[PDB]
């Protein structure tokens, strides 16, 4: 299992968070109802990987299950259903998109 995207590396104090409706990494090959998932500071410094809802190590987490080092991002219009059609990455047969976020999306201090 591999995160389709690259990491948000933290370089400071406050941990990763996102005002409501911000946080989904950009992916033009994905429908509006697929815009949902979680950042898990995964396993030095902390790094948050994006995984879609129902994929990843925590693929049994409901949306909103309050864990630690998981945060829930969802774009207006997404559905609360699993991403079996998207899945995750296999780092051999593909490489990781550079995780980009649209314009106007806020990021904590020490996140770039």
């Amino acid at each position: 299992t591999a995160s389709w995207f690259t990491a948000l590396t933290q370089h400071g104090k406050e941990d990763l968070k996102f005002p409501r409706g911000q946080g989904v990494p950009i992916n033009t090959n994905s429908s509006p109802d697929d815009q949902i998932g979680y950042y898990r500071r995964a396993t030095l410094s902390p790094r948050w990987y994006f995984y879609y809802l129902g994929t990843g190590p925590e693929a049994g987490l409901p949306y909103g299950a309050n864990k630690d080092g998981i945060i829930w991002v969802a774009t207006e219009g997404a559905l609360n259903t699993p991403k079996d059609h998207i899945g995750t990455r296999n780092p051999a047969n593909n490489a990781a998109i550079v995780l980009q976020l649209p314009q106007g999306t806020t990021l904590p201090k020490g996140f770039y």
């Binding site: 409501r20 049994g60 409901p62 909103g64 299950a65 309050n66 864990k67 609360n80 259903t81």
Partner: protein
Amino acid sequence: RDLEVVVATPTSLLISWPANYYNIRYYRITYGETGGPVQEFTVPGSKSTATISGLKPGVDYTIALYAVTTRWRLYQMWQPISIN
């Protein structure tokens, strides 16, 4: 939308949260006076609203939603501040 109270009343309140019809088995609501007779009740997964009732007017009450998944696991759906 999010986990927040919709209708509020001096004897009860209406809570709501985003539905889920693939992963939850039942929700478990839990609620008592702040710090200090704990109480709870149970709602099926398909539902996404619940009617806490029979409260003491004017008194502060910490609420919490909790979820049990299909993998027989236990998790809490956020956490909300409630005080009159």
